[PDB]
Design a protein around this ligand. Structure first.
Ligand SMILES: CC(C)[C@@H](c1ccc(Br)cc1)c1c(O)c2ccccc2oc1=O
Lengths: 99, 99
């Protein structure tokens, strides 16, 4: 739908058989979620943010239903304050900025 | 205009008599810019991001021309990797998410 920026742009994702909410982030190149159980293998990886650098697990080819749309990409799991859906997934569900 | 998410959503702001580019961030509640000279008074403030917490200067009532639109808000100046225009300013220039 159309979403104004008066409140945090929050959205219900379904991931790895579980329900969660997550922040729509056009600032973010990648998708990062707080600590949660996911099947398969991962790779130790590191990202940077405002504060500094954090160390994540990389899962690839993880199916996510964002507000009822399908998408499949790399999801980084770690020590984030917020659930970030960035641009790798944003493009799939067909998202844009209008102003 | 309309902006796809295939590349980082970068935009030319004019601030404190200078030109710079900055990242359109719907994830960000506030606007934070790297270290630069601004007139007036400020307050020592602290924010959090992925990585951790950083310490900023707060300037209030700073006029910014984002892609040729006027806006006046709180701008936090500090040690960010990127120039962030978040939601405090986003709303002013009339921004939305469409998907
Ligand atoms: C929730 C964060 C992940 C997010 C954020 C940004 C500003 C503020 Br105030 C609060 C949060 C965030 C990015 O969207 C980001 C984008 C590009 C580069 C670095 C980045 O660091 C970040 O912390």
């Amino acid at each position: 739908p159309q979403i104004t920026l008066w409140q945090r742009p929050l959205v219900t994702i379904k991931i790895g058989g579980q329900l969660k909410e997550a922040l729509l982030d056009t600032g973010a190149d990648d998708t990062v979620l707080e600590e949660m159980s996911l099947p398969g293998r991962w790779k130790p990886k590191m990202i940077g943010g405002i504060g500094g650098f954090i160390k994540v697990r990389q899962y690839d080819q993880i199916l996510i239903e964002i507000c009822g749309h399908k998408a499949i990409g790399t999801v980084l799991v770690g020590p984030t304050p917020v659930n970030i859906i960035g641009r790798n997934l944003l493009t799939q569900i067909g998202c844009t900025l209008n102003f």
